[PDB]
Amino acid sequence: YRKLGRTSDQRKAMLRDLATSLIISERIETTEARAKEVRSVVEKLITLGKKGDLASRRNAAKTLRNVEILNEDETTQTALQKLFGEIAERYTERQGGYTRILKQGPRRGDGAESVIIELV
Amino acid sequence: AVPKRRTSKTRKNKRRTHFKISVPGMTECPNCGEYKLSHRVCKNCGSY
Amino acid sequence: TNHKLIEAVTKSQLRTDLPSFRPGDTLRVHVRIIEGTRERIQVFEGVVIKRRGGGVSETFTVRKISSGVGVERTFPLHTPKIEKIEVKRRGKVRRAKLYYLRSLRGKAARIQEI
Amino acid sequence: TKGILGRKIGMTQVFGENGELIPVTVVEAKENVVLQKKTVEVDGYNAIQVGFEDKKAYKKDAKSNKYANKPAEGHAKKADAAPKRFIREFRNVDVDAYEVGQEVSVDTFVAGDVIDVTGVSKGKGFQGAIKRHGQSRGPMSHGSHFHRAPGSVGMASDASRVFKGQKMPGRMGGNTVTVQNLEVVQVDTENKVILVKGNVPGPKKGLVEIRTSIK
Amino acid sequence: MIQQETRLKVADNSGAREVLTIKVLGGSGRKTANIGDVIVCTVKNATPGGVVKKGDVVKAVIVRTKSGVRRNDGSYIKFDENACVIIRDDKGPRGTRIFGPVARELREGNFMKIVSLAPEVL
RNA sequence: UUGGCACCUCGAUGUCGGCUCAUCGCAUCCUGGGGCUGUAGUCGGUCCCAAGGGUUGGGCUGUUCGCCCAUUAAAGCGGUACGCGAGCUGGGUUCAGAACGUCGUGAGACAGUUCGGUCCCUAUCCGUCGUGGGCGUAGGAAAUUUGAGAGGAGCUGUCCUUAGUACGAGAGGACCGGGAUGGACAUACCUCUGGUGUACCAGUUGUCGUGCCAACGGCAUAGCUGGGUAGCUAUGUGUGGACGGGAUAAGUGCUGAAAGCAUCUAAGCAUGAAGCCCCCCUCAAGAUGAGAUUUCCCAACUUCGGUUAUAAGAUCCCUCAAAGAUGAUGAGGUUAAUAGGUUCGAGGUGGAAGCAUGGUGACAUGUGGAGCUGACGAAUACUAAUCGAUCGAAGACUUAAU
Ligand SMILES: CC[C@H]1OC(=O)[C@H](C)[C@@H](OC(=O)NCCCOCCC#Cc2ccc3c(=O)c(C(=O)O)cn(C)c3c2)[C@H](C)[C@@H](O[C@@H]2O[C@H](C)C[C@H](N(C)C)[C@H]2O)[C@](C)(OC)C[C@@H](C)C(=O)[C@H](C)[C@H]2NC(=O)O[C@@]21C
Ligand SMILES: [Mg+2]
């Protein structure tokens, strides 16, 4: 696996935060390496969501941050609830994938290959 | 640990023979015809 | 096949007659020592300390006290110099390797049955 | 006398007669085919070329060594064989016995021969003076600033130069090594595997050239 | 793995309760030893009396090191303490009530009186 | 070595010991071959040939040296700016402080002691260790190659047998060869024993937070503690220095005369060493002499090739690791298992959650070797290697066979 030029605690934190944000937005923009490394984490969380039993819920609560989404009509529900009620159904029949990645050109401030990781 | 002598213009230009930027990996985009980087999304159109 | 071949090659050399046990069990071990005269059997008694990866490569370990001097012997489970094994009594532990018995002597090294 | 191309799969152990842990390296030799028979008057030295494994056949627009190229298809079709992945040759063998197009089989080796396995070492990459060369390194305390670097590279004004062969930092591995006087413990003809006592050079999934000891 | 400046317990009633080593016999540059190997050593704690007294230089043969020894079948025998026994330059001990177990590898080295006068051969 | 001379260096050539790394001579310390002896063999002494390899760990001093304690087959002598400080130390010595003894009325002094006392430098060139690109090898390519050369190894102990034999009043005691095991050292590898394993498992303290109990997350060296997969590793596992040729050294001869004898010599022809050459391991056609084998590709405009673009072949680009600083090498790019995910498994950890039972409680038991599980094995196109683009031959003269 990759280290992302960062320590262990700071990476653990970055990976879980990036996975949460992806789950919120359903497509985000970042650099190639971190997309390549958040792919597995988000894919595994969705797996914890395709079962929905209380054990998998409690276990997926480890990674996701506690965030609130305001849906249409001022309806509110958290990241766990999204994962287990709006994304489990979408991928009940698909047996992998769950994400795609679309390389983009280098950014200006660096030569970093920005990419967009999106939930498929 | 200091240059014992000058590096003449000949030696200088010689060392930097291999110091150059490569032309980008660009291919034409199938939806718009403008060039794009290969394996990247066209920035003019937004396709594949 | 490019995967089962290791097991496909060692299967002819794996024993089924050995019993099933776990670390923390005091078991008697029958061994066939071949001295200069014959192959006289002899018995080793100890407490299992650990055991390792499967295949012919599994090795377990036993520990005992001889004359107040701790002795530990490690065997492969498929070495053909074992005539028989007896799991003389069971053991309630909470580890998979029992390294922490190298500092205790006497009742401190106590084990509950079952 | 005998030679087979194989690849290394891993290591295990065998309890042999008289209960002895024989450390073993399992080698998978399958579809070894002779592709030529070099001759003294045709090429200047008599030997035979063996192809191992099996590539796929030519395809237009191939982008990898998976498939054979037109040049290799032709070389192998002259021996009515499939394109192969690794090709080596053997000199110690006597050519008259063999024949172009035959399969070299694991059963060429009987239990208890003496063989030499020639492979390539594992890469360690760019490595320092003491891991690459076994050098004693300096003091780690007592106010030292010479921990792992190599020591003097020469003398002084006499030989105002560093002599060739001075054991300095570089890239370790990637060297052909021949371990000698190994032996085979069993040959299995169905899974196509020659087991060799000891250990052999190389990464897992590599290539070994087993032949009969020259000593 | 026993090297010089290593303190070992004595396994005899010869008179020395604990000793340390200087060399490992057997070769130029030899550095270590295991069961069945002889060394030179000078006692550091003697019993009041005994045939061997404190500060003497003596031959001795290793028994039951804690690094232990591999046997040809893949069996390993390890121990919880280093130990040694003094010898009389004929592979013969001095005491006659040796204590503690002894490995079976001392049989080969023809330390038979050591193997015969032992609580447990192993 | 102690000196003599003052020839280069005072617009600076760091000086002694130790550490790291060696390299070369041989007037050889061990090992190999011999002549001998006031050599019965083991013993020793002497001289000759021999430099291939090897030629310890400590106590004491800043010490080189030397002495001492244990070993070894031996613990060799020297050169290399008394090798090596832009590789290291800085104990001694040689700045300023201080102090004792001595000399000086005194300031101070002593190569008399003593305690303390700042070791800078980002490597341009040559050199050296690795690793790329260009071009040449009379076409363009893919693979296998011979070996001109070059490098690496090269050490040796003990036991048993012959044999208690030869030889010995005895005491003692092989030569040869033929077996067996070591030491040191070099290599390759992780099956075993171990180490490490900061995205594996588990227990636990303080504190903050997800309202709350229960569950969990952040921080405290990874908070700590017990384990531990892959990888990487030694102290761990195998292997190696085994034969055997050819020419020799001191030496030993054979036939043999000058010199009808002799005599190893002059013709010739023998034997003889860890030494030389080969043998064994590795690199090697930039070996500009550029070598060899097999295969693949083969047209059609010219207005005359100083020709397109294309073959065969690669690369760009992208998924990767058995490879890696980068570039290279190697496994793959949909006609696809290259990597991710999913499913199953190995190995690791050790009895998840929620329930029900029992306890006042701290807890325990069954579910259920359960739950979790980074690299390890397999299957599966679910996701990404979609699209595309660039480079790449048409084969010279001369003479002889044809
Ligand atoms: C940190 C960067 C600076 O470097 C340095 O300080 C380094 C450390 C220095 O190394 C050394 O000390 N010797 C090597 C250590 C030798 O110890 C033996 C025991 C002693 C002594 C001693 C004797 C007399 C006196 C003295 O009498 C007195 C007073 O004051 O009277 C003051 N004390 C302290 C004395 C002490 C440089 C490199 C030094 O050169 C070297 O000196 C030698 C005299 C000759 C050397 N060669 C020509 C043979 C020479 O190579 C200099 C002189 O520096 C003091 C360098 C000069 C150019 C500088 O001035 C630069 C700018 C430094 N200044 C600074 O700021 O940056 C520095 C680079
Ligand atoms: Mg000057």
HEC string of B22-33? Answer: CCCCEEECCCCC
CA distance E69 to chain D (A): 15
Strands D193-197 and D20-28: antiparallel
Beta bridge partners of C26: C47, C89
Q: Does an H or E element contain E112, and which?
A: helix E112-116
Residue with token string 């009389």? E88
**B31 sits within 7 Å of strand F by its CB:** no
User: Which domains does chain A carry?
Assistant: 1-120 (3.90.1030.10)
**Residues D200, D118 contacting (CB under 8 angstroms):** no
Count how many domains chain C has. 1
Q: Is C43 on the interface with E (CB under 8 A)?
A: no
3-state secondary structure chain A: CCCCCCCHHHHHHHHHHHHHHHHHHCEEEEEHHHHHHHHHHHHHHHHHHHHCCHHHHHHHCCCCCCCEEECHHHCEEEHHHHHHHHHCCCCCCCCCCCEEEEEEEECCCCCCEEEEEEEC
Beta bridge partners of C71: C64, E79
Q: How far is the CA of B2 from the centre of ligand 2 (A)?
A: 15
Q: CA nearest A46: which of A84, A14, A13, A8?
A: A84
CA D176, CA D168: separation in Å to the nearest integer? Answer: 20
**C87 sits within 7 Å of strand F by its CB:** no
Q: Give the method used.
A: cryo-EM
- The CA–CA distances, whole Å, from D61 to A88, D55, D66, D68, D83 equal 41, 16, 12, 11, 17
CA angle D168, D172, D178 (to 5 degrees): 120
Q: How far is the CA of B4 from the centre of ligand 2 (A)?
A: 13
Q: Name every chain E residue with its beta carbon within 8 A of the beta carbon of C72.
A: 77-79
Query: Closest nucleotide (CA of D214 to C1')?
Result: F280
CA E6, CA A28: separation in Å to the nearest integer? Answer: 64
The DSSP annotation for chain D comes to: --EEEEEEEEEEEEEETTTEEEEEEEEE---EEEEEEE-HHHHSS-EEEEEES-PBPP-TT--STTBPPHHHHHHHHTTT----SEEEEESSS-TTTS-TTPEE-GGGSPTT--EEEEEEPPP-EEE-HHHHH------SSSS---SSS----S-SSSS-SPPS----SEEE---EEEEEEE-EEEEETTTTEEEEES--SS-TT--EEEEE---
Contact positions of strand F to protein Cβ (< 7 A): 19-23, 55-57, 69-75, 80-81, 83-90, 121-133, 141-147, 151-152, 182-194, 198-199, 210, 215-220, 222-223, 226-233, 235-243, 280-283, 292-297, 312-320, 322-325, 330-335, 337, 340-343, 346-354, 369, 371-375, 377-378, 380, 382-389
**Residues C98, C50 contacting (CB under 8 angstroms):** yes
> Which pair of structure tokens corresponds to residue E76?
């390993």
Q: What does the DSSP 8-state code read for residue E72?
A: T
Residue with token string 């605690």? A9
Strand order, beta sheet including D47-52: D86-90, D47-52, D32-38, D103-104
- Count interface pairs A-B at CB distance under 8 A: 11
Q: What does the DSSP 8-state code read for residue E106?
A: G
Indicate the residue of E73, E74, E77 with minimum beta-carbon distance to C71: E77
CA E55, CA E47: separation in Å to the nearest integer? Answer: 12
CA E84, CA E111: separation in Å to the nearest integer? Answer: 12
> Which pair of structure tokens corresponds to residue D163?
């002599």
CA D90, CA D67: separation in Å to the nearest integer? Answer: 25
**CATH code for residues E1-122:** 2.40.150.20
Residue with token string 């894919």? A43
**D92 sits within 7 Å of strand F by its CB:** no
Exposed (0-12), middle (13-18) or buried (19+): which is E10, by Cβ within 10 Å?
Answer: buried
The DSSP annotation for chain C comes to: --STHHHHHHGGG--SSS----TT-EEEEEEE---SS---EEEEEEEEEEE--SGGG-EEEEEEESSS-EEEEEEETT-TTEEEEEEEE----S-S--GGGTT--GGGG-----
CA angle D92, D97, D100 (to 5 degrees): 95
Q: Is B32 on the interface with A (CB under 8 A)?
A: no
Domain region containing D27: 1-215
CA D88, CA D121: separation in Å to the nearest integer? Answer: 17
Per-domain residue ranges of chain B: 2-48
Yes or no, beta carbons of C9 and D28 under 8 Å apart:
no
Question: What φ, ψ does residue B25 adopt, rounded to 5°?
Answer: -75, 75
CA C100, CA D71: separation in Å to the nearest integer? Answer: 65
Strands D184-188 and D125-127: unpaired
**Residues E43, E88 contacting (CB under 8 angstroms):** no
Question: What φ, ψ does residue C84 adopt, rounded to 5°?
Answer: -175, 155
**Residues C111, C47 contacting (CB under 8 angstroms):** yes
Resolution for this PDB entry, in angstroms: 2.5
Count how many domains chain D has. 1
**D164 sits within 7 Å of strand F by its CB:** yes
CA E95, CA E107: separation in Å to the nearest integer? Answer: 18
**D2 sits within 7 Å of strand F by its CB:** no
Widest CA span in chain C: 53
Protein E20 CA to nucleic acid F64 C1', in Å? 33
Q: Name every chain D residue with its beta carbon within 8 A of the beta carbon of C39.
A: none
Rama region for E85: left / alpha / beta (φ>0; ψ in -120 to 50; rest): beta
Domain region containing C6: 1-114
Closest residue (CA) to C1' of nucleotide F349 is: C96
